[PDB]
Amino acid sequence: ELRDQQEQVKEDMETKCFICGIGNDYFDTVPHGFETHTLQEHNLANYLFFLMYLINKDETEHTGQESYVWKMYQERCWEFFPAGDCFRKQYEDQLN
Amino acid sequence: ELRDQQEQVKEDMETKCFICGIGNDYFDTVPHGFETHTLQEHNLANYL
Amino acid sequence: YFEISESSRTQWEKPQVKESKRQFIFDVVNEGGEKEKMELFVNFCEDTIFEMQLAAQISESSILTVRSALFALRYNILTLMRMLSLKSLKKQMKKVKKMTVKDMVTAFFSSYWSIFMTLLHFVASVFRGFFRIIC
Amino acid sequence: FWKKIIAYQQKLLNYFARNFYNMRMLALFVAFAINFILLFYKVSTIAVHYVLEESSGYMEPTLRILAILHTVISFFCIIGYYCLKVPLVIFKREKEVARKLEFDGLYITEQPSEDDIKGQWDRLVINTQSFPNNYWDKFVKRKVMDKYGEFYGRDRISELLGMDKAALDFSDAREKKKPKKDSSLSAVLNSIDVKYQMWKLGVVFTDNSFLYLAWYMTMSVLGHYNNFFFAAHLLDIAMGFKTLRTILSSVTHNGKQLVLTVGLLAVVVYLYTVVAFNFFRKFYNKSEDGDTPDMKCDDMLTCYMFHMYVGVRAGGGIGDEIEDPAGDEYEIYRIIFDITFFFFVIVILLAIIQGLIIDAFG
Amino acid sequence: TMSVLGHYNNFFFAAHLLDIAMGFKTLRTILSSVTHNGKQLVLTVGLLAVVVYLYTVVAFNFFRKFYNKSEDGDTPDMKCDDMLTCYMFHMYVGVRAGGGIGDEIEDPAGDEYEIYRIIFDITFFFFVIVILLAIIQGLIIDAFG
Ligand SMILES: Nc1ncnc2c1ncn2[C@@H]1O[C@H](COP(=O)(O)OP(=O)(O)OP(=O)(O)O)[C@@H](O)[C@H]1O
Ligand SMILES: Nc1ncnc2c1ncn2[C@@H]1O[C@H](COP(=O)(O)OP(=O)(O)OP(=O)(O)O)[C@@H](O)[C@H]1O
Ligand SMILES: [Zn+2]
Ligand SMILES: [Zn+2]
């Protein structure tokens, strides 16, 4: 069971996107769709570097989005994280 | 098989609502959605 | 869109952060609460940021077997190429041009037998090189 | 005068390629025949002589005839493989070499990592004139020149792949027709790209199936020196049948875990041996005669070997073999020792190894 | 036919107790489990017979002094002087024994071939008893399952 759980973790990580939770099938319509989604669009490293960038930046210079996210994180609410939706889902009709 | 049935009972109880039978995914769109559905809306204690 | 520092990229690529990310991904996927998934991710982000800031302070204030195998191939195949480079096969073939089907078939077989002996010499040389490597 | 010898060689080449499988079938049948005859091979009695025993009396010449036939059929099998499947392997390897050379420039822009035998050995073939010998695309050289030469130097790429420039211009310009000399021995021999043949022989030697068929032939040859060497040819069924192939591949499927678990078992039995060598040594006498005491745990290596062999094979554990502790001051300690040995070594770790192999097969 | 032969010999009526194996569904499935994977079960038994044959071939050539099986010194009973006898002994007494062939054949301590015979016995135990027999048993059991 322990080995199966490790294998299931790896399979879930290769087939699911960690942030939005959408399936890789919805992204793999284009070649390397899931890889592009996990590298360019939703990336854990990018989110961590975003947090570092907001920590390092001065309050007065935050943009609108940066100030929104900063207040959201100060009050410890995680609505800004995409939940089941992405850019493609948001603009599906216009983009495609 | 007996142990698996006990585990399946517990998993079904944590993932399904007993009264309406709708999946927890349909409720978990909001945070704590399934918990709110199982406590405020559909609760065995409340029915009793 | 924002700016990512190259130093931040290097400290992310440092092995310690890689191990920490292994542990965090395993923990979250195996047992991390779905309602607490984002909370745990933000906590791990803060911990990793502090680990990066600590790693910065701390930091700034086989092939020989492939070599042997290639040499074995080169030497053992050049050994067979020496057979053609001697150029003395022409005098022998002067005799074969006038003799019969059985002997031409015999030479046909002899060529492949020589190839197989070349392969045996090659594999023996590979083994010997491996003994020298391990010793 | 050679147009006949090439035709006859082609006929033999095609015959061997056509009947490669049937010869491999016949070799296995002969392998069963030799080993069935070898099943009536007794000792006769200084040196001991091994003689075939039978009532018919015609088994002995048959054993020589079958051995010679097997040795010939094996050689014919290697020949047939070289006729049939070697060209496919060469065509493939030559195709991926061109793919890497052109699309991502694995010998111009970026160099092989030097830890792969294939990339290092494929450097030789690009210089050879007789390139895509099997591959269809004969102008991969032209494509790489047009797509990389301006960046890396036209003449330098030309020397790296061994091209020539005057030939293209001459062929595009006016030319004449002149009958050739087929008798030219020097020209005929020099046309053979010895470097390309060197590369191809290297590829064939590195091929796994050719190595298997060479090992088969080696055992067939050694069978003449010793007839019992023909028993190794009964392992060919394990390759022929799919289920036996899967059974063998089950062991190698989890090789890393299987090695690690065996190492863990060897460490655990080593810790148990270390405890025994320090505390429980009087219980390891293994001689019935009182005059000569045979101690299996006076020496560290001897005690470890005994624990590895007689303790692991025994179903109950080490306590089934070593002497009973009743009445001794260390009774409870040795009871715990034996019980823990039985639980950890026999019950758990061996079961882990067996489960690894069985569930890999599954 | 068994009913008729029971009159010639009364013990022939014991074969009629196999009719319950047809009457009851679970016993029918248990019997059908063997025939369910018949090809694989035959092939694996052949592989086992080949492996034990290779081990017997090695033993007949190198380790023969260890196969004496007589307590009385006057009459030495050798089970591996003959190829067929050694193979039969390895098939029977070696396969049935849980530990392996080394549980039955004589101890190698102090002999020049000590390490070789230790490896021989350990490999026999691992490949034959631990793996192949487990493969056969698993085939039958999981066919039933
Ligand atoms: N939001 C996400 N951010 C990053 N990777 C994600 C995300 N969602 C899913 N993934 C997947 O998780 C995996 C993370 O990358 P990956 O584990 O391959 O790199 P790594 O951490 O260097 O480890 P390794 O290369 O050794 O597997 C990828 O398969 C990627 O597709
Ligand atoms: N209609 C329902 N009413 C109540 N709980 C429901 C209902 N449908 C599903 N559930 C789920 O069944 C479980 C019942 O609560 P839970 O078993 O946690 O409390 P408990 O009876 O005190 O036992 P314990 O806390 O020891 O598990 C919860 O996980 C709840 O989400
Ligand atoms: Zn995503
Ligand atoms: Zn409900």
Side-chain angles (χ1 to χ4, degrees):
Chain A
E1 288 159 328
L2 281 179
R3 192 267 300 163
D4 290 330
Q5 296 156 33
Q6 290 167 7
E7 287 313 329
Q8 181 63 254
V9 171
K10 182 63 69 178
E11 191 269 333
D12 283 343
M13 261 329 222
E14 301 298 335
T15 53
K16 301 289 95 175
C17 174
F18 181 49
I19 295 306
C20 59
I22 317 168
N24 67 299
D25 62 310
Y26 173 83
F27 301 121
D28 283 327
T29 80
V30 297
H32 312 67
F34 183 65
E35 290 80 1
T36 50
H37 170 83
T38 48
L39 273 297
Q40 299 308 295
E41 291 179 353
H42 294 169
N43 183 220
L44 295 175
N46 299 341
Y47 278 89
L48 188 149
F49 294 137
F50 186 67
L51 266 293
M52 191 181 298
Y53 169 78
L54 273 68
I55 277 167
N56 301 340
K57 194 189 232 164
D58 199 14
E59 297 319 303
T60 57
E61 341 272 351
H62 290 286
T63 63
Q65 289 171 307
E66 294 185 23
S67 278
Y68 178 56
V69 175
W70 183 250
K71 175 178 49 58
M72 272 285 302
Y73 162 70
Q74 285 310 298
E75 66 184 1
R76 321 269 310 163
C77 181
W78 318 121
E79 287 314 296
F80 60 94
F81 282 117
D85 201 80
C86 55
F87 206 84
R88 308 191 197 172
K89 291 178 71 67
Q90 182 62 76
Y91 304 104
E92 185 62 28
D93 56 356
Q94 284 198 277
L95 187 64
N96 317 86
Chain B
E1 288 159 329
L2 281 179
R3 192 267 300 163
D4 290 330
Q5 296 156 33
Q6 290 167 7
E7 287 313 329
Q8 181 63 254
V9 172
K10 182 63 69 178
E11 191 269 333
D12 283 343
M13 261 329 222
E14 301 298 335
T15 53
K16 301 289 94 175
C17 174
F18 181 49
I19 295 306
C20 59
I22 317 168
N24 67 299
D25 62 311
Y26 173 83
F27 301 121
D28 283 327
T29 80
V30 297
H32 312 67
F34 183 65
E35 290 80 1
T36 50
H37 170 83
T38 48
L39 273 296
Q40 299 308 295
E41 291 179 353
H42 294 169
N43 183 220
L44 295 175
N46 299 341
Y47 278 89
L48 188 149
Chain C
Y1 314 93
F2 57 97
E3 159 82 21
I4 299 180
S5 181
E6 72 276 17
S7 83
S8 299
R9 297 294 295 272
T10 68
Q11 317 278 32
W12 178 255
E13 290 295 329
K14 288 268 202 63
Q16 186 178 3
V17 173
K18 298 252 181 283
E19 167 276 309
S20 187
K21 173 173 135 41
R22 302 293 67 76
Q23 308 311 112
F24 177 73
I25 296 298
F26 176 53
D27 288 330
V28 162
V29 179
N30 216 2
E31 73 256 5
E34 297 80 20
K35 64 183 182 293
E36 299 173 292
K37 192 179 292 294
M38 293 317 342
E39 176 70 27
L40 297 169
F41 172 56
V42 177
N43 289 320
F44 157 80
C45 281
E46 301 153 17
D47 301 339
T48 318
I49 282 165
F50 174 73
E51 185 180 49
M52 293 180 159
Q53 302 155 334
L54 184 63
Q57 177 247 319
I58 292 178
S59 289
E60 82 265 10
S61 306
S62 65
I63 296 91
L64 192 151
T65 69
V66 182
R67 194 52 264 161
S68 66
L70 288 150
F71 177 110
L73 289 171
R74 260 165 205 155
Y75 180 56
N76 279 119
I77 295 302
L78 275 160
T79 306
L80 204 53
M81 293 309 93
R82 289 320 199 222
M83 189 180 85
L84 271 294
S85 305
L86 292 178
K87 302 309 192 218
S88 75
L89 299 187
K90 280 73 177 175
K91 276 73 67 179
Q92 290 105 60
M93 291 303 265
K94 290 292 191 291
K95 294 187 286 185
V96 308
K97 290 188 286 184
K98 63 220 168 177
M99 63 174 130
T100 78
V101 178
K102 270 308 157 171
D103 297 334
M104 66 103 40
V105 182
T106 310
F108 162 67
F109 288 153
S110 75
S111 69
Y112 282 93
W113 177 255
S114 66
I115 304 164
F116 164 72
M117 300 298 307
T118 299
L119 174 54
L120 291 180
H121 291 330
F122 165 64
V123 61
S125 83
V126 168
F127 291 147
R128 190 196 332 129
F130 185 74
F131 293 105
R132 272 84 59 85
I133 295 161
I134 64 190
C135 294
Chain D
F1 63 112
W2 49 274
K3 303 154 294 312
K4 283 75 176 174
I5 79 183
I6 53 184
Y8 190 67
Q9 284 176 355
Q10 184 63 255
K11 174 260 203 189
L12 294 178
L13 184 66
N14 292 340
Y15 171 64
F16 291 136
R18 188 182 300 112
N19 293 264
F20 166 73
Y21 287 104
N22 315 322
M23 294 182 286
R24 270 277 295 161
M25 194 358 246
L26 195 55
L28 182 60
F29 184 76
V30 166
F32 287 102
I34 295 179
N35 279 127
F36 166 78
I37 298 195
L38 277 176
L39 204 42
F40 313 111
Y41 202 75
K42 69 181 287 184
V43 68
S44 65
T45 299
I46 57 147
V48 292
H49 312 296
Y50 293 156
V51 295
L52 204 58
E53 193 274 332
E54 68 261 5
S55 49
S56 85
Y58 184 118
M59 265 176 168
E60 182 66 26
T62 305
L63 193 61
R64 304 285 77 75
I65 299 154
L66 279 175
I68 292 168
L69 184 62
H70 194 236
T71 300
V72 174
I73 293 165
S74 302
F75 186 50
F76 288 170
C77 288
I78 294 90
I79 307 176
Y81 185 81
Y82 188 82
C83 310
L84 192 70
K85 292 197 175 295
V86 166
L88 197 46
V89 172
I90 300 292
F91 165 80
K92 294 188 290 291
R93 179 87 159 275
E94 217 177 10
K95 165 168 82 52
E96 291 86 5
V97 165
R99 293 269 172 276
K100 309 153 46 186
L101 189 67
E102 194 274 331
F103 287 100
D104 62 357
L106 192 141
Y107 302 94
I108 296 90
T109 65
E110 197 283 329
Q111 291 311 307
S113 65
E114 289 99 7
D115 59 304
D116 54 313
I117 191 66
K118 185 179 286 185
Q120 296 313 110
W121 188 256
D122 288 353
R123 203 177 303 249
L124 303 151
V125 75
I126 62 170
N127 306 266
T128 74
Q129 295 319 292
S130 288
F131 196 54
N133 194 41
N134 288 2
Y135 192 32
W136 301 319
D137 199 299
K138 302 291 190 290
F139 278 46
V140 63
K141 301 227 196 174
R142 297 284 76 78
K143 265 177 301 292
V144 184
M145 186 65 138
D146 308 335
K147 183 262 188 181
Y148 280 161
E150 58 88 20
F151 198 48
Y152 295 102
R154 295 306 271 210
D155 211 43
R156 201 270 291 165
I157 299 300
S158 180
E159 299 300 328
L160 190 146
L161 281 77
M163 271 146 298
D164 57 353
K165 178 62 70 177
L168 304 198
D169 184 356
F170 185 75
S171 179
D172 278 12
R174 305 187 265 116
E175 76 274 14
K176 67 183 291 295
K177 66 181 178 67
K178 179 68 173 65
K180 291 313 282 190
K181 184 71 174 177
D182 68 281
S183 296
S184 298
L185 295 174
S186 81
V188 159
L189 67 91
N190 276 313
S191 66
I192 309 160
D193 194 298
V194 295
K195 195 166 189 288
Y196 177 59
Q197 298 293 319
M198 180 280 295
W199 176 80
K200 160 170 78 49
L201 267 68
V203 178
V204 174
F205 285 12
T206 45
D207 182 71
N208 302 321
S209 296
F210 190 67
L211 288 169
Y212 178 77
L213 299 173
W215 162 82
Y216 187 77
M217 172 78 265
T218 309
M219 296 310 170
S220 291
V221 160
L222 276 173
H224 287 282
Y225 299 128
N226 198 47
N227 299 301
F228 276 111
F229 271 108
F230 280 112
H233 303 108
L234 293 178
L235 280 162
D236 190 38
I237 62 168
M239 299 326 346
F241 299 103
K242 187 182 182 36
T243 303
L244 283 74
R245 187 184 300 114
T246 313
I247 291 161
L248 305 178
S249 278
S250 312
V251 193
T252 46
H253 187 48
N254 275 327
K256 181 69 176 177
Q257 305 197 289
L258 277 154
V259 160
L260 284 183
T261 303
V262 169
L264 195 46
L265 189 149
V267 167
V268 169
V269 188
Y270 172 69
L271 295 159
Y272 278 126
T273 305
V274 160
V275 159
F277 172 74
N278 292 27
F279 299 112
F280 319 119
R281 256 186 302 127
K282 60 200 310 298
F283 305 120
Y284 282 67
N285 183 28
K286 216 74 177 293
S287 55
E288 295 293 328
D289 46 357
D291 59 356
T292 53
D294 187 74
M295 289 304 234
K296 291 290 183 68
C297 197
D298 268 11
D299 183 16
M300 194 56 226
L301 202 44
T302 301
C303 197
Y304 182 64
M305 201 66 273
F306 171 82
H307 271 93
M308 269 315 322
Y309 178 50
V310 190
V312 181
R313 287 186 296 112
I318 197 60
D320 282 15
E321 297 291 328
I322 50 177
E323 190 275 331
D324 190 73
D328 194 78
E329 65 183 1
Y330 284 158
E331 176 148 17
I332 178 67
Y333 301 121
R334 183 186 174 281
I335 283 180
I336 298 161
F337 170 76
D338 303 326
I339 288 283
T340 52
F341 194 98
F342 170 60
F343 190 52
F344 289 138
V345 185
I346 302 299
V347 174
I348 296 159
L349 276 184
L350 207 69
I352 294 170
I353 303 172
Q354 165 181 306
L356 278 167
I357 296 176
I358 303 301
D359 78 353
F361 173 61
Chain E
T1 309
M2 296 310 170
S3 291
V4 160
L5 276 173
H7 287 282
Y8 299 128
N9 198 47
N10 299 301
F11 276 111
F12 271 108
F13 280 112
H16 303 108
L17 293 178
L18 280 162
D19 191 38
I20 62 168
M22 299 326 346
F24 299 103
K25 187 182 182 36
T26 303
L27 283 74
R28 187 184 300 114
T29 313
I30 291 161
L31 305 178
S32 278
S33 312
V34 193
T35 46
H36 187 48
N37 275 327
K39 181 69 176 177
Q40 305 197 289
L41 276 154
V42 160
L43 284 183
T44 303
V45 169
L47 195 46
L48 189 149
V50 167
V51 169
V52 188
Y53 172 69
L54 295 159
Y55 278 126
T56 305
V57 160
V58 159
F60 172 74
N61 292 27
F62 299 112
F63 319 119
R64 256 186 302 128
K65 60 200 310 298
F66 305 120
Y67 282 67
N68 183 28
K69 216 74 177 293
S70 55
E71 295 293 328
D72 46 357
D74 59 356
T75 53
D77 187 74
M78 289 304 235
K79 291 290 183 68
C80 197
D81 268 11
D82 183 16
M83 194 56 226
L84 202 44
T85 301
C86 197
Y87 182 64
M88 201 66 273
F89 171 82
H90 271 93
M91 269 315 322
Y92 178 50
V93 190
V95 181
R96 287 187 296 112
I101 198 60
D103 282 15
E104 297 291 328
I105 50 177
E106 190 275 331
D107 190 73
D111 194 78
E112 65 183 1
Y113 284 158
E114 176 148 17
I115 178 67
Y116 301 121
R117 183 186 174 282
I118 283 180
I119 298 161
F120 170 76
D121 303 326
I122 288 283
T123 52
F124 194 98
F125 170 60
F126 190 52
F127 289 138
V128 185
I129 302 299
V130 174
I131 296 159
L132 276 184
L133 207 69
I135 294 170
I136 303 172
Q137 165 181 306
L139 278 167
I140 296 176
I141 303 301
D142 78 353
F144 173 61

